[PDB]
């Protein structure tokens, strides 16, 4: 195994807004005088301490400003090694609204919005309409709509409702899924059918 190792080792790492991530860089070298160095390439570095672990970098109260690429560098015996890690800072609170608040037979459509979130790219941010856990068949998505409220986003997914039949399901469930490298979160909001 090569001399310079970082934990966690993944090339890109995720952290929640306002939360903290600590990254540990260590160098296995036989000569003393050996050292490593964290550096912020794209962003401000963060706080580095040299004792525990080996060289421990800590991002604290993470803001969107913390996202970006950082590298730890170190030489052993004349050979310089680097380890790059990219940090993603996301916002995904449990603020999921539905419109209408409750469904009345005769309602053509339903909308569900995830509030003050980021990122909002469909590969990471996805919506679903569910009934009894299963996606509601016949439901027709109209397409996401991205809006505002660091600047976060509100994202609205609208669904054309299918015939609900009898007995009408007791409720449908709007669900937002957040998928990022190493992250899968979901919030479900209820939709009472009256």
């Amino acid at each position, epitope marked *: 195994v*090569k001399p310079l190792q970082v934990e966690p080792p993944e090339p890109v790492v995720a952290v929640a807004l306002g939360a903290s991530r600590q990254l540990t860089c260590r160098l296995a070298c036989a000569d003393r005088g050996a050292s490593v160095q964290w550096r912020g390439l794209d962003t401000s570095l963060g706080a580095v301490q040299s004792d525990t672990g080996r060289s421990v970098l800590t991002v604290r109260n993470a803001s969107l400003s913390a996202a970006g690429t950082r590298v730890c560098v170190g030489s052993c015996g004349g*050979r310089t*090694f680097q380890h790059t890690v990219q940090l993603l800072v996301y916002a995904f609170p449990n603020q999921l609204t539905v419109s209408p608040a409750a469904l009345v037979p005769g309602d053509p459509e339903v909308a569900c919005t995830a509030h003050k979130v980021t990122p909002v790219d469909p590969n990471a941010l996805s919506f679903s309409l569910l009934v009894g856990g299963q996606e509601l068949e016949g439901a027709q998505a109209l397409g996401p709509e991205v809006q505002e409220e660091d600047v976060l986003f509100r994202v609205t997914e609208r669904w054309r409702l299918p015939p609900l039949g009898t007995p009408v399901p007791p409720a449908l469930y709007c669900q937002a899924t957040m998928r990022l490298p190493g992250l899968e979160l979901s919030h479900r909001q209820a939709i009472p059918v009256l």
Partner: antibody
Amino acid sequence: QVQLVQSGAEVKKPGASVKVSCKASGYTFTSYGINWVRQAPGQGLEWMGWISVYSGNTNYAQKVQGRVTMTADTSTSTAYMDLRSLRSDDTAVYYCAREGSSSSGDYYYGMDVWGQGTTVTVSS
Amino acid sequence: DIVMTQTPLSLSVTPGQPASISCKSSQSLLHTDGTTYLYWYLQKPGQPPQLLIYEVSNRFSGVPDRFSGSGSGTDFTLKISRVEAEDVGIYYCMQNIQLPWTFGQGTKVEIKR
């Protein structure tokens, strides 16, 4: 495109001194070290010395130890080889090359990007 | 200093024919961390040196699969399944395990007509 641009050819008298520069662009200067390797006319390659950009540590080859100083300037992304007490037998093309690993530290590539070289003609 | 000896130091290759270069170090290039630090460089006429193979058998970006590096311990071989005119120049091996880094004398490759 990762690039190392060296200063122009030099003529110096025997016993003088010369400082060759190596300006870095297209990559992170501090994530790689810098080697200096020379080639005397119609001759093989020979490693001359090494500067660790991030730490300031160096290592010199026997042929230049005691009369060379190599450094790196993080303010201008430039590395220097300073060779004093010049000999006719120092006449050579001097190359600088970045030296380092893959971005994860996974593989050690060695010298994957080279400067165009600098002709140093030690002559009277 | 580790001594690197290439044999032969001159190759004349018929277009299409394979070429083989031996590189032997006076001591093993395997490190305690498991890596074997043997590297191949090519210097074409009038041009700066370029990385050809890293860690015994990994071809650098842009290096055709007709170049293949192999070996372990103190004996290594660079093979070229075919030698095109663009391949002519001087090939060097180099150890990167123990300072000072040392190169072979360089094997000169030329087309045989």
